[PDB]
């Protein structure tokens with residue numbers, strides 16, 4: 001989408017995975033979807049270093065709406081859970097130097113059952129723009145026809161443009177097409193800043209594996225369409241929650257960097273371990289994700305329960321991730337000729353290699369004929385950065 | 393098995409899950425299966441508080457043997473990886489105040505391909521006793537008949553008894569029988585101190601879940617036969633390794649305590665986090681596992697992606713575990729009438745409840761009319777101890 005936005009993958013926080021559709025503010029006040037939750041999250045995004053690391057968008061997902069539209073036919077926030085309304089919440093978020101994202105659905109209802117946007121694309125777009133919204137996530141539930149889906153996503157893109165406000169447009173169009181037909185990613189790119197391809201993530205290693213395996217299986221189809229202004233979205237980062245071991249969290253961070261994924265955390269910033277915070281705020285890995293060249297990485301090889309992925313970076317640099325998919329035993333040694341990496345360009349005539357994950361450590365100079373030797377933990381990843389050099 | 397051993401579930405360390413069958417001592421001298429590995433673990437079991445916490449058995453799994461028997465037909469340890477031999481390793485382990493476990497197979501080969509014990513049961517038992525072995529894990533690979541399987545496990549049990557040495561006897565008899573015929577656990581208990589029921593564990597939450605689900609599904613068959621001298625073995629603790637989140641490690645520790653399981657760590661004692669070490673050495677949770685009454689717990693209910701398990705303890709106390717099996721979202725509240733717990737006796741007329749996991753905290757007095765409310769992390773467990781006030 002040519003709106004000048006998302007020139008690097010968008011970074012922020014999204015409530016869905018950790019908080020879902022919890023409407024019980026009497027019995028579960030700390031977990032229900034309410035304006036107080038988002039205000040506190042904004043405060044912590046500032047005070048705990050998230051904004052500095054680059055996480056800019058505070059995003060509301062489903063279940064913010066009142067059961068029905070108002071007298072003028074416009075959407076309204078829930079009166080009990082959002083008494084002061086979206087405009088005042090946007091003012092607060094902007095006052096913290098952050099941007100506000102919101103959610104809607106292409107069909108007649110949202111996935112959770114709240115008012116959909118069909119028939120209201122231009123007025124809903126104008127409502128969001130008046131409220132000060134900076135990002136829209138557009139879901140695809142309750143729409144069982146491809147023509148309606150496509151026209152909806154295109155229409156809402158054009159309506160957002162016509163409002164005149166800069167709004168990141170996040171689509172679930174490809175995901176909802178697959179039951180019917182393979183998506184045309186050139187068209188989707190034309191209309192969207194990023195697009196969900198695959199099933200929702202949850203707080204499990206099984207889910208991470210399923211997303212990685214789907215991405216590598218389909219990589220001929222999706223890797224080259226990604227770039228500044230339009231990204232593949234493999235769904236939220238779940239680091240800092242409950243279901244991933246430390247090595248599995250490292251794997252998710254490393255591979256979302258390789259994949260040029262939007263980095264939308266879905267966690268509770270009020271209750272997050274120092275280790276999880278340090279990984280999510282890791283300057284070098286974020287710098288890989290945000291690389292200005294904007295070329296998505298890919299799976300280079302797979303075998304013997306190992307995977308090697310790599311991503312080209314600006315200035316003849318490359319990032320390389322090595323995953324150990326064997327879920328028994330101990331760290332396994334993996335060796336590869338550096339000439340096999342980075343299309344044979346990374347280490348010609350030499351490269352300096354720095355390990356970034358699981359720990360940062362300079363590995364030294366490797367000649368084009370050299371071999372790289374590493375040990376990789378079960379379900380963990382080693383992430384390396386290769387800098388081309390003629391020194392040595 | 394009435395040998396006077398395993399009066400509480402056996403606790404120790406076993407190499408298999410973390411170190412497997414690594415024979416490459418040229419490139420990986422520090423992780424290959426060798427006498428140096430077991431010496432290093434024994435040293436740390438003493439120096440890092442494991443023995444004090446109760447972990448007593450240092451166990452060799454498969455891949456210790458030389459490719460073939462010696463001239464006199466006896467098993468021998470690999471000459472390169474175990475140059476001083478098993479008897480000398482046992483002497484060292486005993487000098488540290490620990491006990492030594494070893495591995496053999498009822499059939500013609502071990503699962504990894506080394507000499508099996510079929511045709512050699514009495515000589516193998518006498519060899520182990522002469523070496524000073526204190527525990528035998530007896531695998532079931534390469535056994536071509538259910539009759540040979542049963543006869544082997546029984547014969548080896550009797551041969552061990554006849555050596556006169558106290559040797560904990562760990563069997564895989566049920567596991568290898570189940571695909572073909574339902575096991576008779578009264579018989580197995582007659583011959584074994586503990587028995588493997590289900591597929592090998594690995595370093596994953598999927599494995600933990602499958603073991604718990606198999607145990608609860610079969611619990612009418614296996615819970616009541618367990619007790620002092622004979623335990624269900626759901627396989628090793630994998631806490632301290634790579635595949636489990638903190639909450640999943642808590643779930644494994646809590647549920648292995650509820651199930652009166654043997655506690656065999658399989659990890660690297662040289663590289664273990666402070667948190668994992670503190671969980672594995674948790675005095676209150678180990679005391680639940682080691683409760684002298686020896687009554688195995690069971691799943692009380694399941695629904696709404698929650699499970700409740702409970703275990704009766706000595707002195708009118710009960711342990712209660714609540715698992716959140718929903719793998720999305722945040723801590724989820726679960727409430728239950730305390731009158732529903734402990735068969736209606738735990739909190740009649742009242743009980744004092746202490747949370748042990750994930751953190752220790754006294755919760756207070758609960759009347760027979762009360763309801764217990766907790767928030768349980770996804771894939772985590774809350775473990776409680778209930779003390780009747782009378």
Ligand SMILES: *[C@@H]1O[C@H](CO)[C@@H](O[C@@H]2O[C@H](CO)[C@@H](O[C@@H]3O[C@H](CO)[C@@H](O)[C@H](O[C@H]4O[C@H](CO)[C@@H](O)[C@H](O)[C@@H]4O)[C@@H]3O)[C@H](O)[C@H]2NC(C)=O)[C@H](O)[C@H]1NC(C)=O
Nearest residue numbers: 001002003004005007160161162163164165166167228229
């Ligand atoms: C509504 O849709 C229209 C298109 O239908 C869209 O107009 C496009 O806007 C972008 C960005 O505002 C324009 O791209 C710019 O073009 C100028 C020269 O024409 C360049 O100087 C710009 O380069 C800067 O920004 C680049 C990144 O965007 C950087 O790479 C560079 O370093 C510069 O800093 C940039 O290329 C594009 O030309 C128009 N296209 C048309 C057909 O008008 C409009 O913005 C949309 N409006 C809203 C509110 O969404």
Ligand SMILES: *[C@@H]1O[C@H](CO)[C@@H](O[C@@H]2O[C@H](CO)[C@@H](O[C@@H]3O[C@H](CO)[C@@H](O)[C@H](O[C@H]4O[C@H](CO)[C@@H](O)[C@H](O)[C@@H]4O)[C@@H]3O)[C@H](O)[C@H]2NC(C)=O)[C@H](O)[C@H]1NC(C)=O
Nearest residue numbers: 393394395396397399549550552553554555556557558559
């Ligand atoms: C070979 O098999 C035989 C037959 O099963 C087996 O003999 C059994 O040994 C156990 C343990 O030594 C005996 O159980 C003991 O029985 C006597 C009764 O006179 C009791 O004094 C013992 O007291 C136990 O409990 C005490 C407190 O409660 C403890 O302080 C004490 O240490 C004891 O553990 C206990 O009840 C069992 O009676 C015999 N059975 C027979 C038929 O003799 C023998 O141990 C096996 N040998 C080997 C080497 O495996």
Ligand SMILES: *[C@@H]1O[C@H](CO)[C@@H](O[C@@H]2O[C@H](CO)[C@@H](O)[C@H](O)[C@H]2NC(C)=O)[C@H](O)[C@H]1NC(C)=O
Nearest residue numbers: 542546574575576577578579580581582583617
């Ligand atoms: C399961 O095995 C046990 C032991 O092999 C059987 O129990 C014995 O049964 C014999 C008669 O068949 C009795 O004389 C013994 O007293 C029993 N032993 C014990 C310890 O009770 C049992 O019958 C078998 N069950 C089935 C269903 O075959």
Ligand SMILES: *[C@@H]1O[C@H](CO)[C@@H](O)[C@H](O)[C@H]1NC(C)=O
Nearest residue numbers: 106107108118142143144148
């Ligand atoms: C919403 O429902 C109306 C009435 O049933 C229907 O005409 C319309 O097609 C639906 N919207 C979509 C996007 O399918």
Ligand SMILES: *[C@@H]1O[C@H](CO)[C@@H](O)[C@H](O)[C@H]1NC(C)=O
Nearest residue numbers: 183184185186187188189190
């Ligand atoms: C994809 O859409 C673009 C733009 O609408 C179009 O030009 C192209 O023909 C489509 N691709 C295929 C393979 O039909």
Ligand SMILES: *[C@@H]1O[C@H](CO)[C@@H](O)[C@H](O)[C@H]1NC(C)=O
Nearest residue numbers: 499500510534535536537540
């Ligand atoms: C071991 O092999 C022999 C010879 O093939 C066979 O007769 C015997 O039954 C086997 N034993 C077992 C337990 O499989």
Ligand SMILES: OC[C@H]1N[C@H](CO)[C@@H](O)[C@H]1O
Nearest residue numbers: 016061062111112139200
């Ligand atoms: O109801 C909201 C949910 N519907 C989408 C399905 O992909 C999820 O991402 C989340 O937004």
Ligand SMILES: OC[C@H]1N[C@H](CO)[C@@H](O)[C@H]1O
Nearest residue numbers: 408453454503504531592
């Ligand atoms: O070869 C050794 C392996 N065989 C057993 C099969 O259950 C495992 O526990 C482990 O001991």
